Amino acid sequence: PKMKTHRGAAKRVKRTASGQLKRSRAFTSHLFANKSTKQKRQLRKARLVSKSDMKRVKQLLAYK
């Protein structure tokens, strides 16, 4: 039948123009007293899903 989508993932990544996936960052919910001011604005950004992981999740987000 029609293949489904990892709804848990569709809420975490936006698809970018060259087919990349823009992801949000980790280590950013609490315990900020234990992280530096440098770590915090360099975590206030967006990175791209790495090619290693992409090869593992290509189909979980095929319809995005």
């Binding site: 990892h6 993932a9 975490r12 990544v13 992801r23 593992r56 999740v57 189909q59």
Partner: protein, 146 residues
């Protein structure tokens, strides 16, 4: 071409790989699945995204954002896509449809500015960008927002 001498297009067809039929084929005994483990079993393999119990990527990462259930996104027509019309002519949402420059009209029409007119004509659309407005007027011609 005759029905008893036909030929398929070159390189268009290929015989598929039957598995588990003799050693000479190169996929004889284990059928290309290695020796043991889940990969070697029927209906085996592992669910995609699974990482051997390591926390999967898409739970290491946080969700963000929402969806504005009511978006106004428009079928866009570029500046250079308007030089398929003529001089002094009038462009309208439905002319952008008969000529076939816009298929679905989404929630309206929006003129953006990329190329050039080489023309002088009036228009009538739903929304405009600055550069689009400026470039309709340099050559002359109005833009009656509807």
């Amino acid at each position: 071409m005759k029905l008893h001498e036909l030929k398929p297009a070159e390189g268009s067809r290929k015989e598929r790989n039957r598995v588990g039929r003799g050693v000479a084929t190169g996929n004889g005994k284990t059928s290309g699945r290695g020796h043991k483990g889940q990969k070697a079993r029927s209906g085996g393999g592992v669910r995609p995204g699974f990482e051997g119990g390591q926390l999967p990527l898409f739970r290491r990462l946080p969700k963000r954002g929402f969806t504005n259930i009511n978006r106004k996104e428009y079928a866009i027509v570029n500046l250079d896509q308007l030089n398929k019309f003529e001089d002094g002519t009038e462009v309208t949402p439905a002319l952008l449809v008969e000529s076939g420059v816009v298929k679905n009209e989404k929630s309206g029409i929006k003129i953006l500015g990329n190329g050039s007119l080489d023309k002088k004509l009036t228009v009538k659309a739903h929304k405009f960008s600055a550069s689009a407005a400026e470039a309709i007027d340099a050559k002359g011609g109005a833009h009656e927002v509807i």
